[PDB]
Amino acid sequence: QTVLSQSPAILSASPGEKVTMTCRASSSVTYIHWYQQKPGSSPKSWIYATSNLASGVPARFSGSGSGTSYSLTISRVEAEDAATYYCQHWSSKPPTFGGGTKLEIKRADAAPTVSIFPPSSEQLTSGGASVVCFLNNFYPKDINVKWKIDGSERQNGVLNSWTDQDSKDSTYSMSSTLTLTKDEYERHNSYTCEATHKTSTSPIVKSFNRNEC
Amino acid sequence: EVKLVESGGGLVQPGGSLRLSCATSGFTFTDYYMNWVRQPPGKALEWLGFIGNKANGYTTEYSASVKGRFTISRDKSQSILYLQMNTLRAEDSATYYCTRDRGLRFYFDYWGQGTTLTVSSAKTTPPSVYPLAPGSAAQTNSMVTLGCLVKGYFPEPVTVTWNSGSLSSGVHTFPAVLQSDLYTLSSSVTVPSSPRPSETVTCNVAHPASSTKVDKKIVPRD
C-alpha cells in the first residue's frame, strides 16, 4: 500500500523566493520521483530517483530525502514555475502518486477587465437569451460576481467558470453567464454584471439596457 | 526524441468496450515496460497496468480495479501500445496517458499527451456557436474584447481558435460547464481596435464527436 501525502496542498511564492514542498510516505520507500503538470498538459518527469534532474529541467530545482520524508526545492521561483507537482513511489503494487502541491505565483493586485454582452441575435431568434460577462486578467483569484436585472439581484441561472493561473502574467480570468429564455430577457431593461474584488471596496459594474433591434 | 501519441478517446456507454492506442517512436518499443495511467476529474493519478519488455517475456500486470476489465498489448507490426477496456462504467471517465517506465518498476520518464474517455448514456450533440460583440460603440479606453459562446454540446471536447490560431494573444478559452447532460463554454479574444471590425475576427470551433466545424465571424452590431 503505502500512501503518499504531499504538503502543502497550495504553496504561495513570489518570484525570487526559495520554496520547498514535501512528500511523506506512510511507510519507508527507497526512491520518490517527482512530476510537474501544467493544466491542459500531461505530467512531465521533473526529479527522478529522489534527486536527479530530468533532462531539460532548470538547475534551480533539486530534490532530497530518505525513508519516509522527501522534498522538492526551487532555489529561485520564476513565474513559469506555476504548476502542480506530484510525487510517486513504486514499492509494491500498485505504484501510487501523492495528491499534489499546487505552486501559486504571488503577484500584485490587478482589477479585472470586465466586458458585458447582450444575447446574440442568432441565439435570441432560437428562443434563448444568454447574457455573458468576461472578468479578465485579475489577481487574486478570489472574486465575487453578482447579477442584477433592474436593480434586483438574482442568482439562479448563473454559470461561472474560472481559468488557471496565467504562466506569463500570473493572472486569473473568469466568465459568468446569466441564462434565460428570450421571453424572460424581454421583461426587464437593465442588465448588470457586478464584480466585488480585493482591488476595491466598491464593485465594478458593467451594464447595458436591452435595446430591441 | 522519445514520443508517445495517443488516439481513441471519446464517449462510450456503460457496459461498452473501447480500445485506446499510443503510437511510440524514438526508442526500441520492445525493450521497455509500457504503462497506462489515468487522471480522473479532481482525483489523483492512477496507474492501471503495464506490459513488459522482450527480455522479461512481455508480461502484463494490472491494478486491482481494472484487473480483468482492462488488457494491455503491443501491435504486431506497428509500434503501437493498446489499452483494451471492457464493461466500462462512469467512474472510468478520465484522461488516459500511456507512459514509459525507464526501467523495471522505476519511474515514468515519458508521457503521452493524453486522450479522454467519457462513459455515459447521454447523447452526442453538436454545439450551438454564437458570436459576442458589444451592443454599442464601446471604445473610450482602447483595446476591444470579443467572444463566442459554444453552447449545448456533448461530449467534451471542442477546440476553439481565433483566426485559425493567427490570434494567439489575448485569448481566454474557459473550461466548459456541464448541466443536465450538456456542456457550454465560452472564449474571449482581446484585440487592438485597429484590427476590428476593420480586419475580420473569427472563432473556429470544432467538435470532433459530431464532426462539426464552424467559424463565426464577429460582426459589429448596435
Swiss-Prot record, chain B:
Residues 122-218 are annotated as: CH1. Disulfide bonds join C148-C203. It comes from the Eukaryota. This is Ig gamma-1 chain C region secreted form. It comes from Mus musculus.
